[PDB]
Amino acid sequence: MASRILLNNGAKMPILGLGTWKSPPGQVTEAVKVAIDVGYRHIDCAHVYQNENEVGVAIQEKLREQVVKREELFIVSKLWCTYHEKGLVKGACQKTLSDLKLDYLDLYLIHWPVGFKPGKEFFPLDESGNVVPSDTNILDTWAAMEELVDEGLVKAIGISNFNHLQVEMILNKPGLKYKPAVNQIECHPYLTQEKLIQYCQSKGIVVTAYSPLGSPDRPWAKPEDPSLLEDPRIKAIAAKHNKTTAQVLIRFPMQRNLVVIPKSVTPERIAENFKVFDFELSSQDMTTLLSYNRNWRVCALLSCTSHKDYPFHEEF
Ligand SMILES: NC(=O)c1ccc[n+]([C@@H]2O[C@H](COP(=O)([O-])OP(=O)(O)OC[C@H]3O[C@@H](n4cnc5c(N)ncnc54)[C@H](OP(=O)(O)O)[C@@H]3O)[C@@H](O)[C@H]2O)c1
Ligand SMILES: O=C(O)COc1cc(Cl)ccc1C(=O)NCc1cccc([N+](=O)[O-])c1
C-alpha cells in the first residue's frame, strides 16, 4: 500500500505519522530521533503541546546528521484557540516555526473551530469554569490562514475537529482562496466517523485520524472508560495476523484511505507502530472493527459546550 496521499496543493502526505501530544519535552527529542531512524517522515505537532522546541531539536539533528533532507519530511502544526483573531495568526505560526527551527510547515491546521479569549492561558476560564470565548469566527480565521500560504510560511492549510457544517462554511465562502486540504478528527473503532469521512472524502479533503489507539494517556480518562488497546475482540483479530493490537488499530484507518498519527515516546513502540505495511486486514476484519462503533469521544470538553462554534452538537 502506497505510503503517501495526494493533497489539493499537489503535495504528498505520508499516511503514517508520529503524534506528539503528551510526549514530555524531557523525552520527545529521543522519540522523534528514533521515529526518523525507523522511517517516519510525518510528525504531528501543536503549539499547545508545549514541546515544539524539543521536536525541532530532533529534526535539526537528523538533518545535520545527513539522515533525511527537509523536503522528505512532512511537518504539521496547529493554530491554538487563543490565536484566532486575524492579527494574531501570523505571529502564532511564526512562533511555531521558530520553535521547530523550520522555515515552513507542510501543513498548518486550525486546531479547533472554537476561539478563546486571547492571553497567556491556553484555556481561559471564568470563575465558574466555562471557557471564555473570543469574538472571532471561522471564516475570518480561515482568511488569515490563507495569507500564510500566500506568504510562503506554510504549504497547505486545513482544519481539525470541524463538523461537516463548519467545513461547508469554509467551502462556500465567497472569494475562497484555498480549500482546506485536511480535516484532522478523532477516529478509531469506538468512533468510526462514517458520515464525516464520507462527507470530507466526497469534497476532496483528506482525513487524518487522531487518537487511533484511544488515547489511553489522556489526562481526563476515567477507569470505567472503554479501552481499545485492551479490547479482547481486537486482541483476537491481532492474534490471527500475528500482530499487536496497536498494529491492527493503526492499519485499520489506513485501509479507509485515512492518514493516521499514533503517539508514542517509547522507542520499541515507535518502531512497532511503523510495522504496518506488511499485512492486510480482511474484509471481515474491517467490517468487525467498524461494528464496534459507540460514538465514544476521547476528545471533547464540557467547558466548551456552550461556545457558539462547539463542534459536537451536530450529528456529524
Ligand atoms: N487535532 C486534535 O485535536 C488532536 C487531538 C488528540 C490527538 N491529536 C494528535 O494525535 C496523536 C495521537 O493521539 P493521542 O496522543 O491522543 O493517543 P494515541 O496515539 O491513541 O495513544 C497514545 C497512547 O498509546 C500508547 N501506545 C502507543 N503505542 C503503543 C503500542 N504499540 N502498544 C501499547 N501502547 C501504545 C502511548 O504510550 P507511550 O507514549 O508511553 O509509549 C500513549 O499512552 C496525538 O499525539 C496528537 O499528535 C490531535
Ligand atoms: O486538543 C488536542 O490536540 C488534544 O487535547 C488537548 C491537548 C492539550 Cl496539550 C490540552 C488540552 C487538550 C484538550 O482538552 N483538548 C480538547 C479540546 C480542546 C479545545 C476545545 C475543545 N472542544 O471540545 O471544543 C476540546
Distance CA 35, CA 259 (A): 17
Q: Could you tell me the residue range of the domain that residue 61 belongs to?
A: 1-316
* 248 labelled binding-site residue: yes
Resolution in A: 1.1
User: Which CATH number do you get for residue 260?
Assistant: 3.20.20.100
String of DSSP letters for 30-83: HHHHHHHHHT--EEE--GGGS-HHHHHHHHHHHHHTTS--GGG-EEEEEE-GGG
Chain centroid to Cα 11, Å, comes to: 18
Separation of 228 CA from ligand 1 center, angstroms? 12
Q: Name the domain count of the chain.
A: 1
| Ligand found nearest the CA of 273 | 1
Helix (H, G, I), strand (E, B) or coil at 238: helix
* 64 labelled binding-site residue: no
For the chain, the farthest-separated pair of C-alpha atoms sits apart, in whole angstroms, at: 54
Query: CB neighbours of 86 closer than 8 A, spacing ≥ 6?
Result: 140, 141, 143, 144
The residues lining ligand 2, judged by C-beta closer than 6 Å to any ligand atom, are: 21, 46, 48-49, 81, 112, 114, 299-301, 304, 310
Q: Which of 49, 83, 190, 310 is catalytic?
A: 49
- For 159, the grid coordinates are 482544519
Told to judge if 190 belongs to the known catalytic residues of this protein, a careful annotator would answer no
Chain centroid to Cα 316, Å, comes to: 18
Q: Which of 21, 55, 183, 187 to mutate to test the pocket of ligand 2 (most atoms within 8 A of CB)?
A: 21
